[PDB]
Structure 1
Amino acid sequence: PVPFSHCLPTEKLQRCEKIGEGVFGEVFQTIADHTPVAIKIIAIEGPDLVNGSHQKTFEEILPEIIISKELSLLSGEVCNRTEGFIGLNSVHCVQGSYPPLLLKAWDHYNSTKGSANDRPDFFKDDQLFIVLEFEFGGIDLEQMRTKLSSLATAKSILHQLTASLAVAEASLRFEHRDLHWGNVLLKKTSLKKLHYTLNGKSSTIPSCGLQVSIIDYTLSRLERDGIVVFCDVSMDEDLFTGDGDYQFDIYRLMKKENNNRWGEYHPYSNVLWLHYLTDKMLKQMTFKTKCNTPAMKQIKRKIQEFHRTMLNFSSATDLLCQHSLFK
């Protein structure tokens, strides 16, 4: 293990601002070489509860690390290529107490946005963490609930998500398994079209001025050469007992689909998540401009039609290749 200062030299540490959180830990934004990055920091191996849950062991955190790498690498592949997952810059195992400058950032977020986490000031100098440094992906879909232009943007978002998931299905038999709207990131792009390749066939997607990145592989699954990497949630109580959002039904529906056998490949889970996201787009998102032109009213009708038909597709690949929305 390395000290925090290895990952976060002084100027980089000074520029850290907290941008997100979960039971897992903390996410900070900073900058190096003029380029923003997101730093995900997860305590591991220790006995303390953190945000009410036990810390993962090294063995338990490895799947997320491996999957983050494999998905990042899709941006440079040939037959199955997508930039729709987040870039991974580095992963380190760090040892130390939590840096005071990160506690200062933590406090600022707590004062302005409020936090559901414990202030991370109780770790000793032997504490281990995993620090994952990612590309900065923009703002999550949930925080953009009231910020998008029109449902035309929603179409581009769904098309990008479907294409990324398809390429990952084809390359890695990938299932995301936790693609709630906190895990769909949006960034401005000056590209008019985005490019992907699926089983050696290249295509494009109109960007509507946004690039989508999918994040957070804590519950994800994939395989290479029959070696499966996944999170076995077969004995988890709480994951399947959520209420108040269609998100929590997706966990249940995934368990129905796979008969509680999480090592298996069931790409229908990607379809379930895409259905949940389509549902968010039609029910919870609110757009600055409503559908007023005939072209835009046809877009709304097509997204509604996608919502009511997509559950009859077997995978994100089947949706991309066969759904009328993407013709």
Structure 2
Amino acid sequence: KGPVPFSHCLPTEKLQRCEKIGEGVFGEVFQTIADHTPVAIKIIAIEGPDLVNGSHQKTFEEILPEIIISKELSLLSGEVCNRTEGFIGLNSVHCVQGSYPPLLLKAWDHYNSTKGSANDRPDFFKDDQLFIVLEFEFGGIDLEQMRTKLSSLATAKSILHQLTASLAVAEASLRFEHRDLHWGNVLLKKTSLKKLHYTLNGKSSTIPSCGLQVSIIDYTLSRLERDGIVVFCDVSMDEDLFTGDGDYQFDIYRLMKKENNNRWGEYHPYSNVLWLHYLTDKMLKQMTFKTKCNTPAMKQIKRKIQEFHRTMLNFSSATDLLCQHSLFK
């Protein structure tokens, strides 16, 4: 009907349980508890003239694409022909109006004192400020933060398999490209399921979990389509995105532009292969595992992931990798 007050999405008990879990130029992310269940709350200032975290705020029209994409991908958990739970669940979206809640400022301050923030303290917003508030499934901790915490390369294999299957299902259903799948955008949480289920073009299969559920996040650069209407971020005139250095991540932006001839509206699912390659490279070169490959069977998984790294760039999509690559047989 119109924007709601913060206390609509965050009644006092929910607000009092908020702890800050992450941040970016976009704003802030909190974990809280609703009906005994953790959820993640992402809060983005929109439509105002103030710089926030050094950048202008998005308009409603600029933020809408990523909300639409979020929802489409979340909806794949309930589909039939192309079904996956490997994208973050989206529970609700609200437009809220007001100054920033003092209880969230307390949470922001605690994070700043313990971990340090790159952001502005969000205490300067007036009572007319608009925000989008997204409530997500709680996805756990990002892969970059788990650099030293995973059990073994068996776990790495599960994570790669989960990511490849989820991307394949989204290619098949939505002609999806993530386009920014760095290791801060892969979330890991514990699961008691021994195996995870997906369906790709009507064929169902399973993935051993190694006790982890992967969730893909962050759709600001993503592209998909339904009945020929394409939702995508046109970065064709962006300069900075293609001039980064110091990590293979920044090559991937350039490699995508090469692949698509700088036409971001087109469908090039090879971009998903490029991100999976980047992720595999991180698994082999930056991750460090609690148990190394000390037995024949583990040394074989290491060799298969090494083979994946050397061969996967000859595949045309995540779908091609899932269906044809020997790693997943």
Whether TM exceeds 0.5 here: the answer is yes
Kindly provide the CA deviation profile for residues 202-233 of structure 1, in whole angstroms up to 9, marking residues without a partner as x.
00001111110001111111000000011111
Quote how far apart the aligned CAs of 1:80 are: 0.1
CA distance in 2, matches of 1:48, 1:112: 27
Kindly provide the CA deviation profile for residues 66-102 of structure 1, in whole angstroms up to 9, marking residues without a partner as x.
0000000000000000000010000011111111111
Quote how far apart the aligned CAs of 1:234 are: 1.3
Quote how far apart the aligned CAs of 1:238 are: 1.4
Partner of 2:144: helix, strand, or coil?
coil
CA distance in 2, matches of 1:105, 1:13: 10
Kindly provide the CA deviation profile for residues 267-296 of structure 1, in whole angstroms up to 9, marking residues without a partner as x.
011001000100000000000010011110
Quote how far apart the aligned CAs of 1:254 are: 0.9
Partner of 2:197: helix, strand, or coil?
strand
Bigger Cα displacement from structure 2, 233-242 vs 105-114? 233-242
CA distance in 1, matches of 2:241, 2:50: 21
Partner of 1:143: helix, strand, or coil?
helix
> Is 1:36 the counterpart of 2:47 in the alignment?
no
Quote how far apart the aligned CAs of 1:246 are: 0.9
CA distance in 2, matches of 1:59, 1:303: 42
CA distance in 2, matches of 1:150, 1:158: 13
Quote how far apart the aligned CAs of 1:48 are: 1.0
CA distance in 2, matches of 1:111, 1:233: 36
Count how many residue pairs are aligned between Structure 1 and Structure 2: 327
Partner of 1:69: helix, strand, or coil?
helix
Kindly provide the CA deviation profile for residues 178-198 of structure 1, in whole angstroms up to 9, marking residues without a partner as x.
111111011111111100000
Quote how far apart the aligned CAs of 1:53 are: 1.0
**Structure 1: unaligned runs, 5 residues or longer:** none
Kindly provide the CA deviation profile for residues 221-277 of structure 1, in whole angstroms up to 9, marking residues without a partner as x.
100000001111112221111111111111111111111111111101100100010
2:165 alignment partner, one of 147, 157, 163: 163
Kindly provide the CA deviation profile for residues 9-31 of structure 1, in whole angstroms up to 9, marking residues without a partner as x.
10000000000011111100000
Quote how far apart the aligned CAs of 1:108 are: 0.6
Identity %: 100
Partner of 2:126: helix, strand, or coil?
coil
CA distance in 2, matches of 1:148, 1:38: 23
Quote how far apart the aligned CAs of 1:300 are: 0.3
CA distance in 1, matches of 2:48, 2:243: 27
**Structure 2: unaligned runs, 5 residues or longer:** none
Quote how far apart the aligned CAs of 1:112 are: 0.5
For residue 118 of structure 1, what is the aligned residue in structure 2?
120
Kindly provide the CA deviation profile for residues 16-51 of structure 1, in whole angstroms up to 9, marking residues without a partner as x.
000001111110000000000000111111111111
For residue 251 of structure 2, what is the aligned residue in structure 1?
249
Bigger Cα displacement from structure 2, 43-52 vs 157-166? 43-52
Partner of 1:175: helix, strand, or coil?
coil
Quote how far apart the aligned CAs of 1:124 are: 0.9
Kindly provide the CA deviation profile for residues 104-159 of structure 1, in whole angstroms up to 9, marking residues without a partner as x.
11111111001111111111111111111000011110110000000000000000
1:180 alignment partner, one of 164, 176, 182: 182
Question: Normalization by structure 1: what TM-score?
Answer: 0.99
Partner of 1:91: helix, strand, or coil?
strand
CA distance in 1, matches of 2:316, 2:27: 34
What's the RMSD between the two structures over aligned residues?
0.6
CA distance in 1, matches of 2:133, 2:264: 26
CA distance in 2, matches of 1:253, 1:128: 37
CA distance in 2, matches of 1:288, 1:126: 50
Partner of 1:181: helix, strand, or coil?
coil
CA distance in 1, matches of 2:106, 2:257: 41
